[PDB]
Amino acid sequence: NLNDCLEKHLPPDELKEVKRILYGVEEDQTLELPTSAKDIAEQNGFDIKGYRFTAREEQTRKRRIVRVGAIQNSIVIPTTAPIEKQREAIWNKVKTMIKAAAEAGCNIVCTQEAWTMPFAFCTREKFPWCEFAEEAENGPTTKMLAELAKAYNMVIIHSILERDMEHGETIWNTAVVISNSGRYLGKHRKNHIPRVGDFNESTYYMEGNTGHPVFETEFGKLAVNICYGRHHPQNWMMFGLNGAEIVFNPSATIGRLSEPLWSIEARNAAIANSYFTVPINRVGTEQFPNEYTSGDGNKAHKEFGPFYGSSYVAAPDGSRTPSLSRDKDGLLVVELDLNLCRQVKDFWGFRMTQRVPLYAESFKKASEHGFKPQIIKET
């Protein structure tokens, strides 16, 4: 963790000033967690950390206090093993993490991208990796996750490879929202598909056709911006326009070039759209049966990683949580008052001044064939 690194090298007076500029707070707003949740974490060897966001008291509205659990994890057994066994080992691990989140008092829990599988998209092999794809609503993962949602009275958001039986058995990257009643709420498909380096996702699935859905749960209006959609401000924006209060960002990124962006994009989204942001990244390094190349000049290799975790939560007022670990499994519990959203909107006035009609017209012209950019030349 970066925060533990700075608190180990800076005098308490300067640390207060650096923390203010890098996060949004002079000191961490630490949430105390039940001792039993800390137990399950310690025994099973994953981090657990609680943080707190707050809002002003309102006259017309009660505090809408909500706890979210972000789960970042690694894969369990080697990628050269029965795919059913690989999924089950990840199931069992995440089960106890979800148990911890329940006992920490969470209301919403969310996973990283394609949590059920190794991130095999670097290989570009269709076999057996496509067999990981499952039905969004009736797939085994949703069914077992729904029993947890019902039993713990919590909304579960999970990201999986979807196989659409009705639409020609096509494969999709999809987020599934399960209600705290246990009933399936709906799904969102990834809007923006990457084709960069090892992330040959365009190989596996096409761009999403589900729009920008926002899920109205009894724990707030929730949205899911999937992985590479992180790099698209207009994607973040449309979730906001649809009235989202928490937008989850399950992801899986490695690398030297990608890491500097991690602290920037999810953070900015929260600020610009005055809602909460929950970027979750995979952790650990994963090796595969066969050689693959990455589209740079380099030699073929089997090791894909390391995935740098560092999941955090950004608040609409520009403040943010410290990141989770970069290589250890973790659960991030954060308590928040959903009322901060309207308060920031009314104060900063970003939605007031968006000029949406202007931009819809500009974007329209820009997308047309005979589009001529607004360029001023020297006469």
Added chain:
Amino acid sequence: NLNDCLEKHLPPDELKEVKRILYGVEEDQTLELPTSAKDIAEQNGFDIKGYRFTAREEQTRKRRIVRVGAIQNSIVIPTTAPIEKQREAIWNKVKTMIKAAAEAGCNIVCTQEAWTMPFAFCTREKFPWCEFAEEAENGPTTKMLAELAKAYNMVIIHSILERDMEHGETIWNTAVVISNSGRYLGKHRKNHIPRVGDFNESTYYMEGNTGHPVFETEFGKLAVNICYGRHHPQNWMMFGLNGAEIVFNPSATIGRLSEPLWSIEARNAAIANSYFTVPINRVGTEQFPNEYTSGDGNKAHKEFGPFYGSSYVAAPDGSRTPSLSRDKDGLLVVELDLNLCRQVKDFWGFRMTQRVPLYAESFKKASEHGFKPQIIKET
């Protein structure tokens, strides 16, 4: 060539019967070519072959006789060389092929896919291969090709990597139609983008937004179905619905699995839509500077190929030309009467009986989220 193989092993009486079932004719309708065109071909070491299609005489309409030249070629100098030099060597070779086509009396000439470059999309490297992308209308290749179009009074169709300066410098796979006057007519962008094996084209560009344009030239209504669009009957169909008479199919395919389809898909398109089809494929094998993998379990390698050429022309009455060579450069000249199209339409009645309204409604339902397939179960 397959035809030369069968004519070398079968008695003239059975050859007549096999040719009838495999092509659409008992014997080849050979077109005699000017001796000077045969000269340029012989000296520069490429094949030249002429074939003839015909139509019934009409009372209300003169014969609309038209000659098309399909150019299949390989790359020239090693892929480890200045990209400007690589393009220029291919330019000079194709220049003399276009000269041959002019002297053979062609009116329309068309190239294979991305003719200007090695098919570097197997590497997944962006550098320097993206530097091959050029402006559709003002790029050097169109400008030099337009001088040839003007001078030889012939329509030129060529397929290139487009770079769109107005739209964020995005890269596209694009066909450019140059009029016999020398003026640029327009462009079509690839509708269907592959992500299979070595054909990591989704890595380089997105799906086309130009629709299904048909170009009205003084040598007929021409359309371009680009490469992987070959596998999509509905793509072929829409060109037809727009009134195309010749649909060109510039391509670049290798392989054991792909070759059996080559004789099928372009052929079927011509039959179903009652127009002419011109599938052109690259030739030769190409090796690259660095290792790459193909998404099967195999070892990294540098050799991409071999591209199996075999360009042909299919006629709306279900007849077809013999293929060009599988490994040698070639020019295919074919004379045709565009009037065959209406005649086949009026006789077979495919357009009469398409039930387009039914299918537009069915396709609509099938694309919607809550789509339930028309399935009859045992009660």
Added chain:
Amino acid sequence: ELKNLNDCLEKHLPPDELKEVKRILYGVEEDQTLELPTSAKDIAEQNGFDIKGYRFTAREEQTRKRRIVRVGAIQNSIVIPTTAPIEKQREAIWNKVKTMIKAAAEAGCNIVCTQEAWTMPFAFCTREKFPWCEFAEEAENGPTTKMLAELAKAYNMVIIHSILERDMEHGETIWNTAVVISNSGRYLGKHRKNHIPRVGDFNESTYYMEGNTGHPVFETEFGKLAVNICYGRHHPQNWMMFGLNGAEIVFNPSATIGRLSEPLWSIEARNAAIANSYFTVPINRVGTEQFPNEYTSGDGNKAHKEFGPFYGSSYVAAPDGSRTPSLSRDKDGLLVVELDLNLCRQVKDFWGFRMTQRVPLYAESFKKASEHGFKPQIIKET
């Protein structure tokens, strides 16, 4: 004069070259021959019809068992002269197909399918309504389905057959219909011909209208089956819609003659299999048929009584672009092919055709194209 294309090539080509030709013409270097029970071969030889077995395979999956299925395609001719009581004509064909179905059962088939209008001579060339329309029978309660359902029950096999239907509830109208009978013996449903021909001797539009049953796919315990009837062969969008409905094997019962039609036979059903990543089973009638009275065919020619010859050549195309050798062009035959239905998904995942279809784009384009004030997307010289 030609009897079988595959037999012709293997008799004139060196084994080295033959491997190359077969690879590009079919989808395989050598035929994947299925060995058939000796008893099935006996019923075939005694009754003078061909029997040929081929095999298609898929890769092994971790989450799914092999879904292996055996289909029997029956190509046959008519039997007694077309100038005989129509009940006798049908019965003669019944009894011959009965023994062919028996052979299919003993070869281990699970699904069996007929050619188009298998029950009758293809009398639509005459354009006479009498007595040819008396061949029309009720889809569910007609004598043919009743007889065929006993066979389906006894042999535990799905039977698909193509007949002239008479619709008693809807004004006694005549239809070209495929009927699917379950392996339990119960009637599953029917599909009516979507695309009606009006070309040359094929005056089908004279007898029936276009189908109103859509593009149904039958969910049986041996796979999701569909039927593309005859002239629908020429409509990629027809094939496509069965695919969108999730079909795994699409049967294509047909009846075509002649010089202009034959080149297409190897192309269309084959393409459909590729584009839609499912199995395709084109079956064609065999033999030539002569009729009581003269008729003309819409070319400049003299009136005549002989309609044919129907060129058989039934085959099976697989989703991976490979295909079976054709049956004979003049001899009755039964084509048994074993297949693993799992190949469909495997090909879909690998080639990505359904992934990249852009159906919403095409639904919108086809809509505009069908409207009255439609203007084609044409780029002219400025």
